[PDB]
Amino acid sequence: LGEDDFEMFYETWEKFDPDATQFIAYSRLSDFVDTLQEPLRIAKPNKIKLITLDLPMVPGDKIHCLDILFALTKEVLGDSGEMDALKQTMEEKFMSYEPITTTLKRKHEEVCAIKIQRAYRRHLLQRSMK
Amino acid sequence: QLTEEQIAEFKEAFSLFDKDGDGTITTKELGTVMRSLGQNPTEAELQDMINEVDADGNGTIDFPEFLTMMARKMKDTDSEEEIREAFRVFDKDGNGYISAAELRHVMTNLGEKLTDEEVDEMIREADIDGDGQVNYEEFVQMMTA
Ligand SMILES: [Cl-]
Ligand SMILES: [Cl-]
Ligand SMILES: [Cl-]
Ligand SMILES: [Cl-]
């Protein structure tokens, strides 16, 4: 992993964030990380992988470019001193971010939402027969 | 009765935690697989599941056994307490209230999204005082009656 992969990362990133907002919709993330080249790439199917990555999400369900990079990077390297060193290094080189949930909590939120939705639909069906 | 999307998710989750590529996960790994799927069963619930169908005591589960276990657990519809607990994830204060606007967002942003027609009727039925607030413990009691 070297400049080639990171250079590739932001070239790919620009296609997904043309206005250079530094954020991408969570709904586009699976496509984004699938599109990268190896090793940073996480090939499809990757939805549960991305959940397990526990990425911070900000209002409007967006995820910052660096959180993704670091996660993809740590995925290949591991929790090492170099990884820690590289991250801090990269953040400085890269340099409002406020997390309201994470991809991991969000999957549980989806499950809870579905319980509610199904109960409401059942309620509507029961009402219409009585 | 499991949906195709669910099977793909289960396959990805299971394979993701099958450390050895052995086709089997460990019973201890089961809770983590389930959390990767958004399910948060308690240790007691997890033990009940782990205990059933790991008769041999080997400590592993293969994907057929997981599907069967998964299919059983999810098919039975949710109790009122479960539904109440589902609301609580969205209640920032744990006070039994969620704003109607927040409820509307969750309902249409996640999951088996409510249609415009459905969410509007939900809010009519839930915000009984027209004060922008939903006491969901009352609303779940109404909705499950
Ligand atoms: Cl945008
Ligand atoms: Cl996927
Ligand atoms: Cl073997
Ligand atoms: Cl009930």
Author numbering:
A (entry chain A): 1612 to 1706, 1714 to 1748
B (entry chain B): 3 to 147
The authors write:
Voltage-gated Na+ channels (NaVs) rapidly activate upon membrane depolarization to allow passage of Na+ ions into cells. DIV is followed by a C-terminal tail which contains a structural domain (CTerm, NaV1.4 residues 1599–1754) consisting of a five-helix EF hand-like motif (EFL, helices αI–αV) followed by a long α-helix (helix αVI). CaM is a small (148 residue) ubiquitous eukaryotic Ca2+-sensing regulatory protein. NaV1.4 exhibits a unique CaM mediated Ca2+-dependent inactivation (CDI) which results in a reduction of bulk Na+ current by approximately 30% after the elevation of cellular Ca2+ levels to ~10 µM.13 In contrast, NaV1.5 exhibits no CDI even at elevated Ca2+ levels.
The 1.8 Å resolution structure of NaV1.4 CTerm Long in complex with apo CaM (Rwork/Rfree = 20.3/23.4) contains one complex in the asymmetric unit (ASU) of the cell. The NaV1.4 CTerm contains the 5-helix globular EFL (αI–αV, residues Glu1614–Met1706; residues 1599–1613 not observed) followed by a long helix (αVI, residues Leu1722–Lys1748). The apo CaM C-lobe is in a semi-open configuration, and bound to the IQ-motif of helix αVI with a buried surface area (BSA) of 872 Å2. The apo C-lobe contacts appear to be anchored by two NaV residues which are in the C-lobe’s hydrophobic pocket: Ile1734 (120 Å2 BSA) and Tyr1738 (119 Å2 BSA). The CaM C-lobe also forms four Glu–Arg salt-bridges with helix αVI: Glu114–Arg1736, Glu120–Arg1739, Glu123–Arg1745, and Glu127–Arg1745. As expected, in the absence of Ca2+ the CaM N-lobe is in a closed conformation. Its surface contacts the CTerm in such a way that CaM helices A and B of the N-lobe contact helices αIII and αVI of the CTerm burying 495 Å2. The apo N-lobe contacts are anchored by EFL residue Ile1659 (100 Å2 BSA). Apo CaM shows high affinity for NaV1.4 CTerm Long (Kd = 17 nM), indicating that CaM is likely bound to the CTerm of NaV at resting Ca2+ levels. The similarities between the NaV1.4 and NaV1.5 CTerm complexes with apo CaM, in both conformation and binding affinities (NaV1.5-CTerm Long Kd = 48 nM) and the equivalence of the response of both isoforms to apo CaM binding (i.e., increased activation) suggest that the conformation of the NaV1.4-apo CaM crystallized here corresponds to an activating conformation of apo CaM bound to the NaV1.4 CTerm.
